[PDB]
Symmetry: D2
Subunit: 292 residues, 4 copies
């Protein structure tokens, strides 16, 4: 549920840029069959930025219905205004989602005290479990371990998706929080190293197209079989990197289409179709992973 | 109009975080009397992040109403979804604003080609002049000179608010664009240098509280009297730095309240109240500028 | 010998700035008694920068004599001119040192190919085992994993001191080198995390004053008792950080003096005596480690 | 003398890496004929890193001998040990050099107070004018404006070669120092901007191969004809960038050899031969400058 290989699932779109229900169902059945632990619905990879809140709720509610009780669904609920974060979260109260993935406010660059106040007010207007999400290179803002320590004392703040790719953060945070506070990597290329240091799983872009390898990799890691998990990581490492050859989720949507998992690789502006040179790059990395 | 000291005006709020019309009137009267070139309404310093589009449009319309033809108004219209950017611009068509200040998509980190498609599409669906706005430390994305040069060929893309504080950008942009494209600094601490290199003015936080000195400094810079403009800038320099001692607009709203220009220094979460130590750093910057 | 807690030993000096033999002997006996695995003599911490090559050789030869066969001694042999690196290394041929610690050329910023050529020529004019040393924040140059992979094929290039504090490098490098190529951390604050990922030890500043704790910490780590190694790391973490409160080795020399381990804390310009505020900082961190 | 286009001259070498006197003569004749203000002998571009102090002193004495009173010579005299810095300066006392170019200690990362003590001590033991040299990306250390302002009060510390390319530094230094302190750019690509902001000239790599254009560009900048200087700079700009496509002085030595100004493009390890792709990037920059 909050550990192992968690997919940050693309929002597959028809050519008009609206959610494609048939492609979404294909994707969800693929995750149930592959062993994926949970689905993060309309996170970064799911283009939260270009969906209005109604669209975004529709996709979450559609994903939960299609999951049909077979796989837990976590909703992306980030907003950079605290009143908007609370209001988006309330759409999902008493819904069936098992928890929220909520990013540090982006753009407005709050202090650590404003981060603390933002997440505490969100946690207060819900019963859902909250996973903090730190991704400074997107938000302009870095949620520090000390602040995570304060927030971990709030009853329903239960974990963090740490996407800095800064491995020292796993044990800085673990030292400050209780033993059942979940630590998840948001950086595919370092996620196995992150679990080896004591993280509990990964919210993954790579799991979109390599769900079975990823689930297998996190099970081995959780059991302590790191040399064995690493054989899989090496096969996947070209994808861990090349799925960011162009801005995520441009490469992974193309990879989904190439694999027959979705009908189209359409995205919303300002995301642009994959270039010819990106196609070639992602094709080669899919081949190396044994997927094509 | 698009030149000189342009203020990125605060959105003054009452204690419930609602726009305070009386305070906004006082600020606008102050700018008209002090020689400010234009007002940027609901930019970054105006808390665009925490106003929904409807409140956003009310603040701009209220500003135009209060301004009463006495001073031009530019609306911030940035959004990280192209469709939203376009649709927000439409609310301002025929409003009386003289142009729009439109930021690079934040958070989703599009490519240069996606930035190009983003601003081209926005520019296509309006007659209003467009000013591109680059501030990578907020958005996670850096609009490069080459892309500015391509976008400058669009009839109604008329300039750029360059907030990197990277001064090599002035002449890299300038050699790629026509002589009438306006180059505006978005970084108060380096804005006089930017103008000395060829920039045409500043969209400024300092000007909220030092309107007259800013206006004189930018007129002296425009006429080439850099040594004379530098004397005023040295006296405003603690303000240029200390209005950012805590996240902008926290220090500048406190400063406006301390001068009596606005009734309260209230902000919206995730912006938090100024700390005592911040109060003292800002008061000392205000005194060094001769404002208290 | 090339694993466990390896001390980067200070060069204790009398008040004239020359090596103090009695303080050096005190330090070496302290390491033999504490369980320290090996001594790096005239590395960074030993002020290689301010010793001329004769002075530097004298200190190495003096350290080896005092060690008297009880503890292996590794010589710092870095130089940014390849002919100087070869000539310094030759001073130690047939000497009793067990190997060299050789830093990437500093200042002149060579390419990866120049790094390759520099270390390969050094390795070729010696029989001593070579440990590569990467510390970009001092040298301006970053020896990448791919280049380490090439150099690991040279017979007597046997290991790397990785001082970036970038943990992803442990497994990037391990993937490329054979299983007996040694990986040592050059960053105290992350060295336990570095061993947990599969590193074999640490060349340590902290071991100068906490040699027993450090030796114990690396033995637990090597045996897989990470939760137990981490109890020690937490007690030492204020020292891991505060020993860089001022430029290394200014704080550790002061700490050596405060502990009675050396007679004076004299350094050579451009290193300057510890400030009063640094003293207080290092004193508190020594107290937290249970040492004072 | 301390103003205008100053060349950081290459040390031309034969195939065995020894100074090539005939080539050095040709370069010096070229600078005297082309209007270059002064020659920096054995700076960074002169491979100070790989000449021992004795070879270093020979190259400077040979340069003064060849110059024969026709053009002033400044010696690089940097060292990361204060005692060595002092002792190298003594070799140049009464030599005929007009001053010294002395870099911030590299590698050992002293504090601002240690930089202050370092340069003050060097300045104390000579009558020669001293030019401070800041280049953090080589040295790991950044000499800050405040420390420059303190050092400028020393009688014979007369200027700074500022190589950060951070243009805000020009007026931060200038307001802290007397009007006669010289500000020199050490970054060719931003040197015209630096001069437009108030700097007095450039210690330049480009000037090795574009001496006349550089000299005219710096005289036009000194007289305030920035638009005229900008036309020449636009034509030298590919050279400003591409003389750094591989580590400087690799591209500029190849360029001198391609022009026939020196007999060979040999460097000392760890500098390596130019790659074929580098050859082609540099040839194209040379052609764009009109030099081939
Ligand atoms: K609650
Ligand atoms: K909790
Ligand atoms: K239009
Ligand atoms: K235009
Ligand atoms: K050998
Ligand atoms: K080897
Ligand atoms: K003197
Ligand atoms: K002076």
């Amino acid at each position: 549920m909050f550990t192992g290989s968690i997919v940050a699932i693309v929002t597959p779109m028809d050519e008009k840029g609206n959610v494609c229900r048939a492609s979404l169902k294909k994707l969800i059945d693929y995750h149930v069959a592959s062993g994926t632990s949970a689905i993060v619905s309309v996170g970064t990879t799911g283009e939260s930025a270009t969906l209005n809140h109604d669209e975004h709720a529709d996709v979450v509610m559609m994903t939960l219905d299609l999951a049909d009780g077979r796989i837990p669904v976590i909703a992306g609920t980030g907003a950079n205004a605290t009143a908007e974060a609370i209001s988006l979260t309330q759409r999902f109260n008493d819904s069936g989602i098992v928890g929220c993935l909520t990013v540090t406010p982006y753009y407005n660059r709050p202090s650590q005290e404003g981060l603390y106040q933002h997440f505490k007010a969100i946690a207060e207007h819900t019963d859902l479990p909250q996973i903090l999400y730190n991704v400074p290179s997107r938000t302009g803002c870095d949620l520090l371990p000390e602040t995570v320590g304060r927030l971990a004392k709030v009853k329903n703040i239960i974990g963090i998706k740490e996407a800095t790719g800064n491995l020292t953060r796993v044990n800085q945070i673990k030292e400050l929080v209780s033993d059942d506070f979940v630590l998840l990597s948001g950086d595919d290329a370092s996620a196995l190293d992150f679990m080896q240091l004591g993280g509990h799983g990964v919210i993954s872009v790579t799991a979109n197209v390599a769900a079975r390898d990823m689930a297998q990799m996190c099970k081995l890691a959780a059991e302590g079989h790191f040399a064995e998990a690493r054989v899989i990581n090496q096969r996947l490492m070209p994808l861990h990197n090349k799925l960011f050859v162009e801005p995520n989720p441009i490469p992974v949507k193309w990879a989904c289409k190439e694999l027959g998992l979705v009908a189209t690789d359409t995205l919303r502006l300002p995301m642009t179709p994959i270039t010819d040179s990106g196609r070639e790059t992602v094709r080669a990395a899919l081949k190396h992973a044994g997927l094509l």
